[PDB]
Symmetry: D2
Subunit: 153 residues, 4 copies
């Protein structure tokens, strides 16, 4: 009945991982943060934690992923390489909402070096709270994304 | 000659001629190859993403540009193609860093989120900015390829 | 009835009917009063900023909306009018916080920087979000009035 | 021959004031940061430091101002109430450049809670390095801003 939300970061975004845990809780009591990012401030490679969270989402161990890094760009590239993952790099409320409404995104990506924590807060909450629309055209398009995955499997 | 395949969906069709011009503005060496819809009628972004992304994957063009409503769908779909690194950019900084850190080969923009002058800036910056070639970045990009390999 | 004066310059003239509609979308109580140019020919933003800002200052309308290329000129000029608090917004968060913290009475947007769907979001959020009325915010807003007074 | 750049913040942006000093220097050796923000992390009111920096710019004690706060919105409202000041709230490279090119802005405002430090870095550098265009229409429009000031003096 509650909804698990896996969280990953690289090194620069480690400073805000408690923030991320908190922002997930702020979305609602039904959202459970599962912190899977570095345990310390040590330099890491983003694809390893993108992969870690992405696989959890793909295997359905969690419903949602949060990936925070310098820019979030590498996070969104790495995570989308995992089949079943729809990872959206968001920079504001609008992209966060539309990633859910149009793309039924299951991973939100943000940049610690690009986006202020209060906007990251807003992004995480909006992403978790905004439902997928279910509308015919979006379903068809998401299915075409799945078709692209299959053709390369 | 550095060829740049351009794809859009319906809302971004209205600015396709802008994208063609912005690519050229990046320098004489940059050659736009328009692969988007030829009318304003509604299409599905993954069809145009795939088309551009396959061209990049297969080395038929060096770069792609995908423009849609938000660009989010474009970046999800394009990245499903092995060898693609598609970066959804919303400013100069992300456009630059996508090349510097990630050696992105596709740039994604939202026509409904980002004004055309910033889209212009994004495209020019993306094409002009070189990959750093720095050690850690090369290692991380290979790690992306190792994720692809693990699912192929 | 909560009246909202709308002003633009030339690049934002193309979306003036959008702004009129976005104001209405904020709720039935919101009434757009268009005070921008009536043709696409080039104008000077401070003329339209002043016009809208004077209406807000004089209490003839509750709110203003200024749309230009970047909105930066709009926000500089509008703020030169005593009683105006003009907020240049580029997303939902700034639009909300301009009302919550600053009790902004004019919202400024760039047609060349910010896509129309985000402009739509900015306008709706700006108009719908109430000022917090919190103590520190009231004190700081009065401090803004004391800066005006010190130069009048 | 060098160019003084006054820096102010409120409380939340105090954490990054050394960043701001550094970013001004990064624009070039000709740019001299003059830190005028809070000396400590104590809660302050943004208009007081906006005023402080704005007056310095208006009196021409410095050429440029940097104001960093939560959102930067209040900073840009307060600073523009000082005659002679053209304070631009910027959130990216484009607005930073155009504030100089079109508006000959003399104060840049940023939000610590909205904009990541690396974008703030880019904003400050672009603002300081980008020249005013001098073009006829911008001069006329800036003069109309001055005219608005006069009519309320």
């Amino acid at each position: 009945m509650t909804r698990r939300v896996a969280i990953g970061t690289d090194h620069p975004a480690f400073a805000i991982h408690e923030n991320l845990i908190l922002y997930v809780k702020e979305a609602g009591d039904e959202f459970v943060p599962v912190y899977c990012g570095p345990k310390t401030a040590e330099s890491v490679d983003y694809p390893d934690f993108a992969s870690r969270v992405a696989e959890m989402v793909a295997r359905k161990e969690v419903e949602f992923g949060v990936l925070a890094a310098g820019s979030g760009i590498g996070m969104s590239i790495a995570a989308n390489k995992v089949p079943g993952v729809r990872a959206a790099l968001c920079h504001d409320h609008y992209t966060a909402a539309m990633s859910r409404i149009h793309n039924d995104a299951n991973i939100v990506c943000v940049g610690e070096r690009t986006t202020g924590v209060e906007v990251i807060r807003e992004i995480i909450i909006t992403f978790l709270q905004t439902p997928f629309s279910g509308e015919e055209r979006h379903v068809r398009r998401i299915e075409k994304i799945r078709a692209i995955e299959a053709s390369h499997a």
